[PDB]
Homo-oligomer: 365 residues x 4
């Protein structure tokens, strides 16, 4: 299935090893101004921007809109776009293209489809995330029209956790650290991973809130029993390569609390606490949507690993060259895009909820 979404539908050209990757976002309402700066900044962010960097212009990925946009405004038709990659030599990073790399999709792709076809160069994840972030930028444009914004950051790296969350600081951090007091320890874990030709896991925090200070998000986003908001968020995050767990609000700690401790009480303005993480009964309850995504350590490590080849014979996997020491970093941005796409889809699907919405638009608008 190469399509994400029910009405705001993102479809991808899928896994490829060519110089061009494409995608199409359909369901965008018309009249939304296309924020090229936002789109461009999102693509830059995806490259885990750290210490020092030059104009992402010619330096990296450029998004080419081929349709659905007329004079900087969405037309209401599909927005097709192409992303062009490298084209000037390379380095290394590989091994034996006939063995299964541990913790990689090699084995399962081989058995499901049979046809080998395996090459490095961001293999799959990388490319697809570019499609997701680009699409998410459009979803963010839609969300902004009704005052919603999505943000993210890293709260954990190798078990070293953040105590306080500062999203503004994360944006400027080399590792999107949400807690400046735990950042250095976190950076150190990353350096030790690199030093030891190893990788390390991490945890990303994703949030959706109102731009207008503390004003509630729409209440009721989420559809029926089988397209609930938290369900679609989990589907989207867990679907990200490297993700082994997803939490909404209090998450795993929820199961350790008693009813009197968890239940979120309410007063006239809203809920008094947010253990629900913004989703109650499968629908947004107005409070901030809080999501935690757990990433396993990067699969590729420059270390000998026992595995087997396509013939079933034992061999050594030794992936030379540098590798991302912690995929959770770039991952946070992708999770942020995914939350934006899911949320925008829900904003659109909710329009059919009450008869008054139809009367307003048809008998008057």
């Amino acid at each position: 299935m190469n399509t994400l979404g029910r009405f705001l539908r993102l479809t991808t050209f899928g896994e490829s090893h060519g110089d061009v990757i494409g995608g199409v976002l359909d369901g965008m309402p018309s009249g939304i101004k296309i924020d090229y700066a936002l789109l461009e900044n999102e693509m830059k962010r995806r490259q885990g921007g750290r210490n020092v960097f030059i104009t992402p212009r010619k330096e990296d990925d450029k998004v080419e809109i081929t349709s659905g946009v007329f004079e900087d405004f969405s037309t209401g038709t599909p927005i097709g776009f192409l992303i062009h990659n490298q084209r000037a030599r390379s380095k290394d990073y590989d091994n034996i293209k006939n063995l299964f790399r541990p913790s990689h999709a090699d084995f399962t792709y081989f058995h499901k489809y049979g046809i080998r076809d395996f090459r490095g160069g961001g293999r799959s994840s990388a490319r697809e995330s570019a499609i997701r972030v680009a699409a998410g930028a459009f979803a963010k444009m839609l969300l902004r029209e009704i005052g919603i914004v999505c943000e993210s950051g890293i709260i954990e790296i190798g078990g070293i956790k953040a105590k306080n969350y500062d999203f503004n600081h994360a944006l400027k951090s080399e590792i999107f650290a949400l807690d400046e007091e735990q950042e250095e320890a976190q950076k150190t874990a990353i350096q030790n991973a690199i030093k030891n030709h190893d990788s390390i896991g991490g945890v990303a925090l994703i949030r959706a809130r109102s731009i207008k200070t503390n004003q509630k998000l729409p209440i009721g986003l989420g559809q029926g029993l089988y397209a609930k908001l938290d369900a679609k968020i989990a589907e989207a995050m867990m679907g990200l390569n490297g993700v082994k767990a997803v939490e909404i609000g209090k998450g795993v700690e929820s199961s350790l609390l008693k009813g009197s401790e968890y239940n979120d009480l309410m007063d006239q303005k809203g809920f008094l606490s947010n253990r629900s993480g913004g989703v109650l009964g499968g629908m947004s309850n107005g409070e901030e949507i809080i999501v935690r995504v757990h990433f396993k350590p990067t699969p590729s490590i420059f270390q000998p690993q026992r595995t087997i080849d396509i013939n079933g014979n034992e061999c050594e996997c030794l992936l030379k060259g540098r590798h991302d020491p912690c995929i959770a970093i770039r991952g946070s941005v992708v999770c942020e895009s995914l939350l934006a796409l899911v949320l925008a889809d829900m904003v659109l699907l909710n329009l059919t909820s009450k008869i008054e919405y139809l009367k307003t638009i048809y008998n008057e608008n």
Copy 2:
């Protein structure tokens, strides 16, 4: 969205307050022997595992198949079914029902649809689960045809963790406990909850494994990039009311590990470990599929809670009577059913993967 699944599609009548609930499971291949005994035992298990019970055919349950079956065999058309309940005279429990009970869906339903309807009977929940468990019975029947079974159990109740898992013991356990040596401590936690008129959270372990002679599940279940197996498992589980977190394999512990510690190695005999939880790159890798579902404590507690009514007036919510002290217990059975439904759907979608499959069914036909 009242439909779950892509091909094996389960659609429900949704939330209701009547004596009859229904659903229809579409996509069952023809020629499957209907195991009424399985269906019946499944409806039993969803209500708990008390050592003292009253023979079936009465009180509750009793699934009425109205279509899709002929002479005890699936026809290949929609298998519609109905489940009745309620007789004459009950108990009580009902003091004002125009307020939003904390941690319940009343608030979001009201805002989304603007219609009060949250009535007695715990609102519903159990209703939908009856539909899911019944439907899961058919999915299980399908899966059995290719040597796949789904199992589940409780590994945690109020923080009391199980050290060793024995699924055969969980079946006869009053609280589906997987570790007999912690079961009493876990039962004590529930008892303390009832005494204090409170509730507690819990964690259920769901698993799928092969009964085939090779001991391996099919390899490659999971579809493309946006319908990955773990993604779909997370979507179904997290969509279960009460669930705030879903884990696959090593789950949340994955983020604390180094690549070298996590990666599952391979040798002549297959995988040496299974931290991936049987899902690699979004597709089953053959190993056992491991899922952990975290439940928040039961919402309904016989204690005073501050909230507001449907109009915004602050008031006291006091829910009289007895309530499920730990929904995780019954929830485990439902998760099991949902894994069966998701796995069965995937088994069907994978039939299109290789051209050789088409040739065998159409040419060797």
Copy 3:
């Protein structure tokens, strides 16, 4: 696929031989007054609705809503409904029921699924139509809220064509004829079919219009390239058992005209000559939607037909009893319902078209 529609989704229990049939309509906006009179009147028309009749209470089917309705108003959640039927014990009407009845689906069902079920009593159709008409009444209720109405009638029987159309006259006609000056000849054709134990085809005309006198329908109904309005109308109609062709507006006469003859024009509201049938470029142009549906003559005839049996041997199919001489008649009501369902679906999907729609609903609420 037992579900019809994208947003407004009709799902059925499917073909069955029991005494109960059901379905569920998902996606109804909340706050719509349930028109129990309309629902009941629709079920009457579906049953031929000829002359002399008895109270449909102790005579025919009744629609029992099991969910999605509170205090006679749609709640926004799934509207499940059951239809109970059957009376007395049949006779024979067919000797060895192990053969494929000509023009019936026994042959394909047998090969697709390989299960020899086959149980008389209106077989496939009839039952499904009840569900379709019941669901259509809900769709009509939604369409009325924005001033849209759907109607139909017979314009041809056994080649006997109508020249003038009067939908009021069709409503009280034994054969829903639209031309009173052709009705008698049309009825005479039906009597001859019965006399000769044969059947005849017919052509139904279906139309959607704005309740307001000389007022246009919404302009722009239809979604993208693969969910165009005419495409979905065609899909729904052709899906009715017995339909062999579907026409929109000028239909098949279009292929006989020249541009200078055909080619529609405009002014400042909605095309004059309705040759488009209210659909242009896959979308509604505001004019009346005009659809013609061609029905083949009823398959079941009390005559000796050559055919084979489940084993291949040649045998004689003799269907005793009285059969429906012209399904086009009852089918005209179903097509009317199907147009209601499709148009309502489209009205809902269209709500996502302009960003101003979203702002009006979210920023002004």
Copy 4:
């Protein structure tokens, strides 16, 4: 909705006036040899029918497959492709750019989305058709694996009907005529239309048969009640711009037949007639699938036209330069591709019908 298909899913970049249009075909089994020659020839046939009589041009549209193919075999993953076209510098053959030409969805689009988009150039259908024919080739490659082929031709141009159908002859015919005896008269009609700056309607005949000389098609293709084969064929065809009616088998002639005349009787091995057009009960019956598609005369003609602009003001439509005199010609080729796409989709969906299919694929390997 920019996606066609359920399992075999074709998604388009949609309407666009840039130098590139793209699409992606998802759901292709792996192991299918990519027949580049077929794809190229198909794109060639698409052009034929306008300014290409005898020795057709090819100095156009190149197709670039960007994914889902490795070593000339489908990999099982999405097959994304880009179609590069256009040449020369714009000059004449174009009128105003602020009006909705006569019988053009330009009027509907503005009301739906409200954007001054549009620019011209076959409006859009022409481009979408390129995506359809390219995708259709892949579907054909799949169908071939199980011996199925799709063909088409023109049976009628401006009233002049064909009496004998030779699909072989249509291939090398400048107007895809199926009857060489009526061909000259059919060409004259076009000629006259071109000379008078006018246009005429036409009818295309599409069919699918088993490649093996004197062989039956798979029986049972078609899914459930709401995804019947004819219903889906009807949906694809009617969705082509200009199509106003679709016929299956005897089509519109069916409503003029009596059961005893229409009903297809069965012989020792097959049906004695095929008035059903290969579809009985919504499923393939093994006989040839016959489809007739009616096209109105092209909206845009050189002759002076009238209608309305964007603001319902005053504008001219003296469209300079020639225009397509009969869209039915190029339309027949697109319908053929669409039939291939639907049928291939149906071939994949049918693999789920019998439990024996699952056992064969899973337990017999």
